[PDB]
Amino acid sequence: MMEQVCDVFDIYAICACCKVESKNEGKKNEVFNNYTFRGLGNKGVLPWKCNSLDMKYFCAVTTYVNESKYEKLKYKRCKYLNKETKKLQNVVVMGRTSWESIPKKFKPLSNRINVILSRTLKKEDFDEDVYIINKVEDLIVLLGKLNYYKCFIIGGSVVYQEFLEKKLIKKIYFTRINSTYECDVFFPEINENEYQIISVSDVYTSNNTTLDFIIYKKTNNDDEEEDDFVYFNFNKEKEEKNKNSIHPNDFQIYNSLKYKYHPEYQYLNIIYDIMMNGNKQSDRTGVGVLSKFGYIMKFDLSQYFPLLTTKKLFLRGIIEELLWFIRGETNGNTLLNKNVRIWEANGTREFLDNRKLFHREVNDLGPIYGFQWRHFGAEYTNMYDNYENKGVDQLKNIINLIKNDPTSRRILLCAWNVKDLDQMALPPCHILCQFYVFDGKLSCIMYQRSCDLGLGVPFNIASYSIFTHMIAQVCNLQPAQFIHVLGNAHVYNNHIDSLKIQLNRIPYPFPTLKLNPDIKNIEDFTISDFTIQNYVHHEKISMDMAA
Amino acid sequence: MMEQVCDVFDIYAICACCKVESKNEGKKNEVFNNYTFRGLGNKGVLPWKCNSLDMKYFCAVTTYVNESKYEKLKYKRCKYLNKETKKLQNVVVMGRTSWESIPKKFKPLSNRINVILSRTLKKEDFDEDVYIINKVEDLIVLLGKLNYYKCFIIGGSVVYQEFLEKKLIKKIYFTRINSTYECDVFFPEINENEYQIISVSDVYTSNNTTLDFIIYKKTNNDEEEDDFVYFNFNKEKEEKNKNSIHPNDFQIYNSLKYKYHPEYQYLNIIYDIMMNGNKQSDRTGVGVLSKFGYIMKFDLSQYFPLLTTKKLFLRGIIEELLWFIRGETNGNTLLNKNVRIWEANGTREFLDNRKLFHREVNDLGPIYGFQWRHFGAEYTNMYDNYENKGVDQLKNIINLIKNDPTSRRILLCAWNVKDLDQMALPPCHILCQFYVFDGKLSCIMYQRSCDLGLGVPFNIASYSIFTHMIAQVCNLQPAQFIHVLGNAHVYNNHIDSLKIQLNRIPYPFPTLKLNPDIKNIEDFTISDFTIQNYVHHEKISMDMAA
């Protein structure tokens, strides 16, 4: 137990990194990893100018002290140095160039002991209440003589590089700023053997970018109230049924994380839950599943666009499918001719005849979503008919209610037409959307009866999130929450091995969705009115790994 | 440093109490309280004979030690006793009758320091593995001498009586056995202002009764933890309507550490909406606090989730259910049974305000019963014969459960978009979806609009009862009822009444018994339904208005 210097003196690094203009040239087949986030500085300032939320984070972490924990720290440091026996503050250590780019208004940093590394400048060159050191050794000496809680290295690139190479960083509080800026200085490549990610925060939006916060940890290389807890768990299981058939040593990364606050973990945990506690069942398909019943996921669309990052999704298909719904189309050829094959297997001669739809033309999918959204209750004829002002246009009705009766508890769009189910290639998986309006903000609940977690759910989160934006925009509202309720939630046995890979990937900060803001009517959107920005993602996974 | 002997020596009572037969006595509008549960013994044995879960709990609590936590408890007991001096075990103190009540198979109680209070007997009638004592003071002595983790008073009635009388009990680990037996000995009345409940477990079934486990407390008179603070850096100074609702009004709710009783799923949502709800106006000028999207789950295999923090009546809601199953839309059928759930929605004025100018009073239009038995049929009037018109979705979901239990399309849907404008009211209960695994039926009901103070308590009961009915006619056991709330709201006029309700500690849930001979969904009648062992707090008038 030859105690480490960074452990005795609680020396941490905190930084913010953006993505870099591109030294590889263009983004077609873009590879991503931790090192995508490495931009620290440009021309002596920040690459992004201002990030209000990162600065709030920076201030809270570097200012926070827990006075009741100091005693254990003082003792520990005393022993290490061989030693005996008014507001506690953290130390912040910065390079001279970093000190100089802090605005005057903010220097020295409030409620913190400020330490500047310089050779060119000495105490006489500073007016301010700061300690000047001319080498790293002088920090260890200084920390031996101060009362302080923790010590934060706050940059810049030269200072980070020398604290990391000297093995003096216990943890890295790392902000991922999910946008690209011109940068002339970079955080050092973090060695994956020296440091592991132990925590990932929620995703936020600030100054027109998404960001999250992650923590890297240096790799190894009253009392009767806790008794009451134990008592109330007397009737628990020694084992989970498929725990012995899905070995959690296959989830080394997923289980190594302490805080899993990134909203992608809502999806990934449900997979975990189904893998460990799911019911082995047959299904319509013959494939066989693990299943569970009843889950709820919430995504904050004001803060991010929840496109899964732990594998590659493409949105052109599901944006085209959604536009096809809104037009009220049931013609499978329209999608096929845009090279969207979502519905191809469900429109075949064989699939239709197995549904007893012997009088249905190939790719005529019958009165599915689009027909129900624009014409609920009309008699379906064929995919070419003009159902002009036939049946209930519930899409137009919900837009009307959101504009004119926003507190209505009756703003629902329902695809589950009980009369029409046997005429549909497939009864709807997405039963209903309900809308909620508070203070100029639109939330949406979608109830999904049947949830393919490997293949379907990722696309479905994106569809209904995109659809919430479209409806919010034409009603003059801001999008708030997309809330996804899972009925029969299943993992197909043929997805297990690929979902196991996916679960050991750490999510990236989400992207953002921009809509052309001239679109004033739900019918007026086309594919080029939609931009996904700053999609950072792990490699595409084939769910079916057959060959 | 003010320290009492019950805290010094960590002397706990542990007991199991049932309810008591009143051999030709009271029972009118029954008043319940904690003293409802006081049955300890009959003819020197347990009133209920056998309860394997209570015995499993007794064994776990009385057998459990944290050795790591002892140092601090040896320190404390030495300071007190003016002193400072193999494997750690708890003490169990019982009366001689209680000792003799135990079967020889199991005495002496495995891995415990057994102690017996006895005026009659002495060490020579027993052995040296067990200890005898002659009075209560002789235990304070023997505790002072021993290496023991905690000291457990395991009865009987006389032991508990004097141990409480003298105030030597720090905490009471009290099993509530929610059935009635013949009793000849009782636990003593526990005084409110002397002992308070601090924890309430999940409700369970064992040996054909519900039970739960509550904990009474005596009333008075290292670094990864920072990472947690950092992740909360963007949080609020307060919760939105905090100034407005005042959490000091929730002292009992907030004083509890473990709130595992499933009734807390309902009470926690009321607390969530009061603290964090959005102020809105509705179809009227009436105030609500509203939030969007909640799930509750009730284990129908372990209990019937009839709220306990206030009094609920089910005759009306069971009749409404039978009325739905018959396909009826005739509101007069219910009014003639004094079920007035739909009365306000049937009046001339209400139908005229819905634009239903050509609808007969109490002709509720193509609501639930019509959609359940006849989805897609043209509604005419409430008197028409619709036989074999529309989709009988009720019949269909039952055949699906029986023939294709792994179908993901077992769905009963009342939201008929084409018919909404013809209904007195569009359905609040949009759909039921069913799920079958290993001979067990679960049901999700999605509710678009949830009156939490008045509606949701009945709605939990309706759909739990319907789950039992569907399960029984399909030869399945009910598993979970899962309630999804869309627009969840508390009416402002309910807030004072819900504040009272949140401060009441739930009782163990009742059970539902169906007549087991009914194997067709259409053949249930009101006499087929029995709620058993309903223990509840006083009725609450949700709207206090005089």
Ligand SMILES: NC(=O)C1=CN([C@@H]2O[C@H](COP(=O)(O)OP(=O)(O)OC[C@H]3O[C@@H](n4cnc5c(N)ncnc54)[C@H](OP(=O)(O)O)[C@@H]3O)[C@@H](O)[C@H]2O)C=CC1
């Ligand atoms: N995004 C983020 O988290 C952060 C961004 N930044 C950005 O990074 C840039 C600044 O980084 P960079 O240019 O690397 O400069 P630094 O802030 O790392 O400062 C470098 C200078 O620090 C002094 N110094 C460093 N190490 C020592 C040592 N061991 N002994 C003595 N003096 C030492 C020397 O100053 P001297 O020359 O006077 O001797 C050296 O020239 C700016 O663009 C800034 O905005 C800054 C910090 C954090």
Ligand SMILES: NC(=O)C1=CN([C@@H]2O[C@H](COP(=O)(O)OP(=O)(O)OC[C@H]3O[C@@H](n4cnc5c(N)ncnc54)[C@H](OP(=O)(O)O)[C@@H]3O)[C@@H](O)[C@H]2O)C=CC1
């Ligand atoms: N449900 C539950 O939680 C429990 C159930 N029970 C039930 O309760 C009944 C037993 O209770 P009960 O009949 O009241 O008997 P107890 O077990 O309380 O025994 C009372 C006897 O203990 C001895 N004793 C009591 N106080 C003293 C004292 N101060 N000093 C010395 N000796 C003392 C005497 O025995 P002696 O005459 O030998 O001197 C006295 O008659 C049974 O029916 C049993 O099944 C029992 C325990 C727990």
Ligand SMILES: CN(Cc1cnc2nc(N)nc(N)c2n1)c1ccc(C(=O)N[C@@H](CCC(=O)O)C(=O)O)cc1
């Ligand atoms: C060294 N430096 C560059 C800089 C910028 N953002 C970062 N963000 C992170 N996460 N970590 C860093 N090390 C970091 N460093 C700084 C540091 C502080 C201030 C500054 O003015 N800080 C005020 C914040 C005032 C405010 O914006 O409210 C403070 O009191 O912390 C500016 C630049």
Ligand SMILES: CN(Cc1cnc2nc(N)nc(N)c2n1)c1ccc(C(=O)N[C@@H](CCC(=O)O)C(=O)O)cc1
């Ligand atoms: C929304 N949707 C409908 C959907 C989803 N999951 C289903 N799952 C099952 N079992 N059956 C369905 N009919 C089904 N349908 C979609 C959306 C996208 C893709 C899709 O594009 N899949 C990728 C899969 C990529 C891969 O895993 O290699 C592809 O390239 O086709 C399929 C179905």
Ligand SMILES: CN(Cc1cnc2nc(N)nc(N)c2n1)c1ccc(C(=O)N[C@@H](CCC(=O)O)C(=O)O)cc1
């Ligand atoms: C004193 N007594 C009556 C009795 C029964 N149930 C209770 N249950 C509770 N919750 N609390 C009590 N005080 C209590 N007391 C007892 C105590 C232990 C055993 C007994 O045989 N227990 C064995 C094992 C019994 C079993 O596993 O079935 C043990 O190891 O604790 C029987 C009666």
Ligand SMILES: O=c1ccn([C@H]2C[C@H](O)[C@@H](COP(=O)(O)O)O2)c(=O)[nH]1
């Ligand atoms: O948008 C969609 C469409 C389908 N499914 C999945 C759920 C089931 O795996 C299958 C539909 O089959 P049934 O549930 O109808 O049997 O497709 C999705 O997850 N999302």
Ligand SMILES: O=c1ccn([C@H]2C[C@H](O)[C@@H](COP(=O)(O)O)O2)c(=O)[nH]1
């Ligand atoms: O079974 C029922 C019927 C009604 N409501 C409540 C919800 C609303 O407060 C009101 C229905 O009116 P709208 O939400 O449709 O306006 O009654 C329930 O909670 N349960």
